[PDB]
């Protein structure tokens, strides 16, 4: 490791990687307290440069480096793990905006958030992909698969939020060994994902990058979940 | 939402949620781009701080509370996936550092990094499981099955390794269906990962985060990979 | 000292002072390296925050303090001085924005300088006031005096940057004693403020802190020179 | 000015002029909230890295020359300001570290200071200069005066901050011309320095900068004053 990449690592800095940089310099990708830097080995090979790297276009080439290399790959692992999970369905299948939300039938923020949603879901722009999960009230599991259980379980839903769960229900004898599935693997990427709180929300950053909202969002927090 | 904290929103700041704060101070957990950032209204309810928040021993509390909520979490699955793939062990089964590595019999840093590890491995700190791809030259992948096909594959894969590639091998007529299958999982998890460089390394950190070293690591953070 | 704030303390800070904030909240001012920074005791005392606090119309108070503290005070003593020397005024007499530049009859980037300001200048929102030196050419000391002999040192100096330095002079036999006591004082301040290059300019940031400016200007750093 | 670095001004950065850097790179040298920031443009032209170069003997380059540009010269401008004023010493005149103090004859926390710096002055290691003000009480003029009036003020001075100001005094009839001058004029260098309490401390660095201590220091502030 060169003298001054060695001087910087002494200020916090763990190194991952090198990476090929512009103008003869080498890239070195690393992390301070669990945040992505990026260090720049001059053309002398005697210094290095701790900082961001922005071309004429005006992109931070290191952000969109550390999104690429240390945030993205997860995310996108993420994304796809809840795309393949049993969700329910609010909104136009085309909606170009998808929004992931972890929602258990006795939570009241729960509906908030659907009735903040309605613009944009009943306007063909958001979809929202509910994946139930029965973890804050005894009767959770058994009222979240008895919406799994019935005919129309996307629709039983929306009247269940709508409805401020008013919605009366045929609760069944027990919870199925396929409902028991779903809602234990819903839970399962819940606690993934790190919120034990519902509504957790997640949405994809226009540079591809998992973003999560958790609990009834503000109203900029909001308008960045729909796409706006 | 309060005004000091919708003035602090205005610099460039996403709430995720809020959170219990100490004092009678409401606390906010956000993002300023890719980093965490934590917010904390005052008493007088008219003033808020965006900083790190300390106790009386010396924790970073806000620090802790960022990793723990953001950085972490989106890793996990991956490391249970690599947990739950045909890893070799070198080392104590019980040896509490935990640490993965994506390798190729063909890659030159590999035997390194392997040779680097003795002493931690062989103090019991850590275990090194080794996940074999095939990826780097044509008889990778027969080098590999050949591996998993010996009567102790863990043994045979250290000796090469020590050897720097020298051991010599039964190689078969063909590759098992069931070593063609460990290749390409493990060939396909670690793409996901993101790093297409043997060795890719994971290990977790002293905050339990997902972390990656990619080619051979320096002393700094072959420390840092040992638990040390 | 409490200690949260012992703790922020071996993390690089160093205090300052202490100093009241609202909420019955307790404040330090320190610097980490040349940086300021604030400290707040939360009001249980057994928590300290290290940032930046806001109020409810969107000030950042903590910015406020240490530039009213910190970064400005130093540089108060020599915009006195500047004051104080004999500058030549171009524009009116009661301009808003006070603007110092140390310039030399030989120097190209002056009269660059000169001509960019002249929207400011004309409009009556900005003076220069000029602190001739004689430093770059032999005859640069003589041509200074010469202006500052001439009937209208003001005008005598604005007809010979407009003129690219084309203006014909009375050259005197000699620079007077007056003259060469106000070229040299002048290049002792000059010196003094760490710029030995012209032209070097000087004012004052809408925070009231003393700015530089060393060569021509960009186009940013033009306006915000020129109050804009 | 270099497309990259323009993008950089965007992100709140003003330019104070450019200098040369190592390897081809041309440095700007600019501020972001009153702070000193360097950026790079990399050899290639079209790129510009905002951060900090370091060395191969590991000092900070960009630091250094922000404190060399920005902050020294106001500070090496204040140190001698108060070397030429009228000031008081407190122990050997040769000691290595010198110590500013303003310090108004009713001030508790100017004598508790006093205190604390007994072990380094009493050693010979530290040499207090103690300018006088007359600003927190309506005697506190005339007993300044009364101070600088006496046989031997600096042996007034430390017996009456000795004695917890319960030495006793020939005040005079009338602060003379020239002590309202002296007090006049330590008032204004006060001020000018932007501490409204005393004690006011001015001590320098080992980078040659200027820094302060206002009120009674804590035991990592004392020790830094001092030397230590």
């Not at 931070?60 to 550390?66: E, F, R, V």
């Not at 929602?103 to 063909?124: E, H, I, M, N, T």
């Not at 009222?143 to 401020?164: C, F, H, N, R, V």
Request: hydrophobic share 35%; charged share 20%; aromatic share 8%.
């Amino acid at each position: 490791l060169p003298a001054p990449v060695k001087a910087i690592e002494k200020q916090g800095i763990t190194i991952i990687k090198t990476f090929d940089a512009p103008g003869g310099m080498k890239g070195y990708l690393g992390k301070y307290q669990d945040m992505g830097v990026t260090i720049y080995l001059t053309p002398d090979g005697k210094h290095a440069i701790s900082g961001y790297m922005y071309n004429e276009k005006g992109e931070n080439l290191s952000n969109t480096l550390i999104e690429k290399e240390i945030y993205a790959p997860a995310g996108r692992e993420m994304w796809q793990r809840m795309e393949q999970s049993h969700w329910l369905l609010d909104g136009k299948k085309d909606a170009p905006v998808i929004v992931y939300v972890f929602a258990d039938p006795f939570c009241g923020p729960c509906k908030q958030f659907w009735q903040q949603a309605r613009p944009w879901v009943d306007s063909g722009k958001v979809q929202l992909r509910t994946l139930l999960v029965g973890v804050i009230k005894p009767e959770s599991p058994a009222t979240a698969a008895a919406i799994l259980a019935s005919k129309d379980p996307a629709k039983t839903w929306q009247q269940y939020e709508a409805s401020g769960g008013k919605l009366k229900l045929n609760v069944p004898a027990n919870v199925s060994t396929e409902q028991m599935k779903v809602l234990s693997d819903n839970e399962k990427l819940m606690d993934d994902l790190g919120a034990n709180v519902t509504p957790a929300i997640y949405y994809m950053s226009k540079e591809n990058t998992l973003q999560q909202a958790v609990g009834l969002p503000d109203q900029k927090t909001l308008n960045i979940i729909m796409g706006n």
